[PDB]
Each structure stands twice: as C-alpha cells, then as structure tokens.
C-alpha cells in the first residue's frame, strides 16, 4: 500500500485519486493520500475551487519511485515530483499518518471499478502517449490538444495518440478502397493490430487511457480517439472473439462510470447508435448494449 | 464547401472543374417472374462527367456484365462511378486534371473521397443546385450509345454542340439545363418543340438542332412555358 504525501494544500481544491474525490480547504492541514493499491496505474487530480479551467492531474505507479504533490505559488499549481532519497521519504511519510494527516483510498474490497477500467493500460506505454522523459509521471489537462487535432500548435505538451483516420492511404489499400471503407478489418488486423500496436493489450491499453483523460479531465481529442478506436473494432467484419468479449467488459465499465449527467458531452451519438444498431458488431456487445439502454434511453 | 445560388458563377471561371452525376449508371426495369416476384433487369448505364466551362463531356459507359454475381447493387453504383471517375482524372495529363469536382448526389462524396485519396488537392464538393442531369439519357444520341454498347466505353462529347462560338458558358449551360430540365419534366413535349421544323436538323457530329439565335429564343421561351404548365398541370397551382 503506497503513499503521495502533499507537502501542504495552500489554495482550496477539490483533489482526485483515481474515481475517488473529495474537498480541501485552503491551507487545510492536508498532507496525502495513502493505502494506494499496488498493481495499477493511478492518476491524481485536481480542480481549483477559484478556477475550474485549471483542471489537471498527474498519471504514476508507485512501484517506480516515491512521488509526492507540492504546491508552486510562481505557476499556480500543485505539481509531482519525484523523492530520490528513500529514507527521508520513509520519514515523511511514517510522522503524517502518526499525526493522521493523510486521506485514505477508499476502495471497497469487492470493488474491481479501477482494475476494470485500467486492465491493459500500462504506465511506459503512457510515457509514450505523454512525452516528458525526465520524469516517471506523466501530466495531463483539459487543454491539451492531440497529434491528429494539431494536423488539422505546441509538439512538447500534446497527445501522441496512435493516428485513426478512415479516409487516408493508411487505412485504404489501392485497388480495395470500397471494400477496405465498409469493412475495416485490414486496417484493424494488419496496419494497427500487427503493424502498429503489436497486440490487443496495447490497443486497449490505448482505448482505456483516452477514455480515462477524456472522463477525467474533459479532454476533448481523448475522447475522439477513445470513439475512433471503438469505431475500428465495430466496423471490422473479421475481430478475434477474445477482443470482442474483452472489448464488451472494457465499455460496460467505462459507461457503467461515466456521470450520469456527462452523457450528453462525452457520448458521440453517431458512433454508439453505429456500433450497437447498425455494424458488424452490433449483436457482440450484450453488457454495453443492455448498460446503454437502461443508463442512456436518450442518447440512442 | 457546397455549391449553390450565391457561388454559380465560380462554375465558369477558368479553373478546370468537372460536375459527376451517377443517376444513371445502375438502371433497371421491374417485372413480374414466373412464379409472380418481383425481379429487376439491369440495362447499360452511363456516368455523365461534364466540364461546364468547354462542354466537354466524358460518357463513360457502365455494361450491364459490371454487376454480374455481385450484391447491393445500388452501393457498388456509387464505388464504381468513383473507381471510373479517379481512372478518368489518372487518365489526363497533370495540366489537364480537375482542381474540383462537384457531386450531384451527396451520397457520391465519400465513395470519390475514398477514390481520389492520391489527389489530396483535387477538392470534391457537393451541390445544394437540383441540378436536371438525369435527364441525359433523353438526348437521343446519348441513349442510342449506351444501349448499343457490347462492352465499358468511353464516349467523348461536346453537350454544347458549338454554341461558345456565339455564347458564353454562363449562357450555354443556362440553355443546357433548360433543355434537360424541359425533357425531365415532359420528355415528349420537350422533344415535339426540338424536332416541330423538319428544316432545322441535327448535324451529324451535333447533338441538338441547328438553331440561329432568334430560334434559340423561341425554343428556350416554348421550354420555360413548358416547365410552368407542368408545375401548375401537376400541382394544383
């Protein structure tokens, strides 16, 4: 059970660990969050109560390094960093929980929400996606703008998310073009499967980590890159049945967390109502079908 | 962005564009078998590609043996139109290739899109104009072509006959989708008022009546008021 110890909360904020939140109060005697499970990605977040624009987090595994949250009163925000001393951290860490200063992740022992939702996402593919090497944590807003959104202004702080494009050279073989549009299976398999992502693992690591930033944060380009890659799969004709069953559990989880009241802003309408009603795969998906249609009647 | 009423007149400027109209390349007639189903009969089709600054027209003929053994017939139509289209533009010299072309039917912009993917700087635009193109397979000598074709071919045209000897393309084509706009709305009241005088005749390398600029008025007049007493024959107007 790992430990982000806060060296202080100067400005009032509303804190995430993971689906977790909860309110701070300016220069509440806050000093961190402890009993992090091991074995998973997390992401701890932050709204400022004087300005919701300011709404960015922080992506780390604790199993490579100690981390810790300090506030910077010249750039306006509570920023990770890494304790390359272990034993001044250990001493940090060991006086806030005596002095019980630290909010505890709540996690419910039956509850598998956050493994759900992070199965195949793994922190050095992040690193990848998120490019700042001198650290091993990787900064994320609401902001920040893709690879794709900045083809169609600064490389150093955007998404480097694998590029989906139905009408490119990628996704279209010469002399195939009507049968590549309707059925994408090739694109799926041999460009992104094989080619690119190398396995299934991968590409759903992907999916996950842009659904996550897109709930998370409200990152626009997260969330068309989250709709692409369902898109891919459900408009391939030919899908591995281990991707379409795991394919069913990662979605029934995502919608299963999504707020209720987000539905309208995150939820593209075209691409659900395709990809439940009208694609290959519009009879594979039976947990995501049955959650759409009693959370979402309206949506479809 | 779509062509329409405010941006017409770009039609006629001096880059190289060319209107696609697919309504005619998947044809069919309904019958009744045997057994009373219903089964259609393919007939050869055409794809109208026209310059609307020179005339030129590019009729490429689709074989009623395209669509043998194959499904959704309706969908191919639109693929195989682009697959003819993007051969026809490969099939040009560079100075001679399209910067636009502009769909009569939305349903055609992601099939030529999708074919055209190696020219990223040829536009491909659709059409808020309900433009009257259908009705070619009513100029006699276009019909005759396509149900006389064994196999694909390619006719070349010039649908103005020589009118931009005399008038301006914003003129000929105005007079072209009068002329086809008539015989869309009354094929064989339109063709009465083409072929009334035996002494006005059609040249052999013509597709219309050797009209002089007087008769051209009273033709396009007896055209117009032909349009108007349909819309009002039809619509309780």
């Given at each position: 059970?790992?430990?982000?110890?806060?060296?202080?909360?100067?400005?009032?904020?509303?804190?995430?660990?993971?689906?977790?939140?909860?309110n701070?109060?300016?220069?509440?005697?806050?000093?961190?969050?402890?009993?992090?499970?091991?074995?998973?990605?997390?992401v701890?977040?932050?709204?400022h109560?004087?300005?919701?624009?300011?709404?960015?987090?922080?992506?780390?595994?604790c199993?490579?390094?100690?981390?810790?949250?300090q506030?910077?009163?010249?750039?306006?925000?509570?920023?990770?960093?890494?304790?390359?001393?272990?034993?001044?951290?250990?001493?940090?860490?060991?006086?806030?929980?005596?002095?019980?200063?630290?909010?505890?992740?709540?996690?419910?022992?039956?509850?598998?929400?956050?493994?759900?939702?992070?199965?195949?996402?793994q922190?050095?593919?992040?690193?990848?996606?998120?490019?700042?090497?001198?650290?091993?944590?990787?900064?994320?807003?609401?902001?920040?703008?893709?690879?794709?959104?900045?083809?169609?202004?600064?490389?150093?702080?955007?998404?480097?998310?694998?590029?989906?494009?139905?009408?490119?050279?990628e996704?279209?073989?010469?002399?195939?073009?009507?049968?590549?549009?309707?059925?994408?299976?090739?694109?799926?398999?041999?460009?992104?499967?094989?080619?690119?992502?190398?396995?299934?693992?991968?590409?759903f690591?992907?999916?996950?980590?842009?659904?996550?930033?897109?709930?998370?944060?409200g990152?626009?380009?997260?969330?068309?890159?989250?709709?692409?890659?369902?898109?891919?799969?459900?408009?391939?004709?030919?899908?591995?049945?281990h991707?379409?069953?795991?394919?069913d559990?990662?979605?029934?989880?995502?919608?299963?967390t999504?707020?209720?009241?987000?539905?309208?802003?995150?939820?593209?309408?075209?691409?659900?109502?395709?990809?439940?009603?009208?694609?290959?795969?519009?009879?594979?998906?039976?947990?995501?079908?049955?959650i759409?249609?009693?959370?979402?009647?309206?949506?479809? | 962005?779509?062509?329409?009423?405010?941006?017409?007149?770009?039609?006629?400027?001096?880059?190289?564009?060319?209107?696609?109209?697919?309504?005619?390349?998947?044809?069919?007639?309904?019958?009744?078998?045997?057994?009373?189903?219903?089964?259609?009969?393919?007939?050869?089709?055409?794809?109208?590609?026209?310059?609307?600054?020179?005339?030129?027209?590019?009729?490429?003929?689709?074989?009623?043996?395209?669509?043998?053994?194959?499904?959704?017939?309706s969908?191919?139509?639109?693929?195989k139109?682009?697959?003819?289209?993007s051969?026809?533009?490969?099939?040009?010299?560079?100075?001679?290739?399209?910067?636009?072309?502009?769909?009569?039917?939305?349903?055609?912009?992601?099939?030529?899109?999708?074919?055209?993917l190696?020219?990223?700087?040829?536009?491909?635009?659709?059409?808020?104009?309900?433009?009257?193109?259908?009705?070619?397979m009513?100029?006699?000598?276009?019909?005759?072509?396509?149900?006389?074709?064994?196999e694909?071919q390619?006719?070349?045209?010039?649908?103005?006959?020589?009118?931009?000897?005399?008038?301006?393309?914003?003129?000929?084509?105005?007079?072209?989708?009068?002329?086809?706009?008539?015989?869309?709305?009354?094929?064989?009241?339109?063709?009465?008022?083409?072929?009334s005088?035996?002494?006005?005749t059609?040249?052999?390398?013509?597709?219309?009546?050797?009209?002089?600029?007087?008769?051209?008025?009273?033709?396009?007049?007896?055209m117009?008021?032909?349009?108007?007493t349909?819309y009002?024959?039809?619509?309780?107007?």
């Amino acid at each position: 059970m790992n430990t982000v110890p806060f060296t202080s909360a100067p400005i009032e904020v509303t804190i995430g660990i993971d689906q977790y939140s909860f309110n701070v109060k300016e220069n509440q005697p806050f000093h961190g969050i402890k009993d992090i499970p091991i074995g998973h990605v997390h992401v701890i977040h932050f709204q400022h109560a004087d300005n919701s624009s300011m709404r960015y987090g922080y992506w780390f595994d604790c199993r490579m390094g100690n981390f810790y949250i300090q506030y910077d009163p010249k750039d306006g925000l509570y920023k990770m960093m890494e304790e390359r001393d272990g034993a001044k951290f250990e001493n940090i860490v060991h006086n806030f929980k005596e002095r019980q200063m630290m909010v505890s992740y709540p996690k419910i022992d039956e509850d598998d929400t956050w493994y759900n939702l992070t199965e195949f996402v793994q922190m050095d593919k992040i690193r990848k996606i998120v490019r700042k090497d001198e650290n091993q944590f990787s900064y994320v807003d609401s902001s920040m703008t893709t690879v794709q959104e900045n083809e169609l202004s600064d490389p150093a702080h955007s998404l480097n998310y694998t590029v989906i494009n139905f009408k490119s050279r990628e996704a279209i073989r010469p002399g195939h073009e009507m049968e590549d549009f309707l059925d994408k299976s090739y694109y799926l398999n041999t460009v992104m499967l094989q080619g690119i992502f190398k396995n299934s693992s991968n590409y759903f690591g992907e999916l996950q980590f842009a659904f996550l930033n897109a709930m998370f944060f409200g990152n626009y380009g997260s969330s068309l890159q989250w709709h692409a890659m369902i898109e891919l799969i459900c408009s391939s004709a030919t899908v591995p049945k281990h991707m379409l069953d795991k394919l069913d559990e990662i979605l029934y989880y995502q919608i299963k967390t999504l707020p209720e009241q987000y539905s309208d802003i995150l939820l593209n309408e075209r691409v659900w109502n395709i990809c439940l009603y009208s694609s290959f795969q519009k009879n594979s998906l039976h947990n995501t079908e049955k959650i759409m249609e009693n959370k979402y009647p309206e949506l479809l | 962005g779509a062509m329409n009423s405010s941006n017409y007149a770009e039609l006629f400027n001096n880059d190289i564009k060319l209107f696609v109209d697919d309504t005619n390349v998947y044809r069919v007639t309904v019958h009744k078998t045997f057994e009373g189903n219903v089964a259609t009969k393919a007939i050869n089709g055409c794809i109208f590609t026209l310059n609307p600054k020179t005339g030129h027209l590019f009729l490429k003929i689709i074989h009623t043996s395209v669509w043998a053994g194959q499904k959704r017939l309706s969908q191919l139509a639109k693929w195989k139109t682009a697959e003819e289209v993007s051969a026809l533009v490969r099939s040009l010299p560079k100075e001679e290739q399209p910067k636009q072309i502009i769909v009569t039917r939305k349903a055609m912009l992601d099939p030529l899109e999708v074919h055209m993917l190696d020219f990223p700087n040829i536009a491909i635009r659709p059409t808020e104009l309900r433009l009257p193109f259908s009705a070619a397979m009513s100029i006699d000598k276009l019909s005759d072509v396509v149900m006389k074709a064994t196999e694909p071919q390619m006719v070349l045209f010039n649908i103005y006959d020589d009118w931009l000897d005399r008038i301006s393309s914003y003129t000929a084509f105005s007079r072209l989708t009068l002329l086809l706009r008539a015989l869309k709305t009354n094929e064989e009241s339109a063709k009465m008022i083409l072929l009334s005088d035996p002494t006005i005749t059609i040249k052999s390398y013509h597709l219309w009546p050797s009209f002089t600029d007087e008769q051209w008025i009273t033709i396009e007049s007896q055209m117009r008021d032909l349009i108007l007493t349909e819309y009002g024959r039809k619509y309780n107007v």
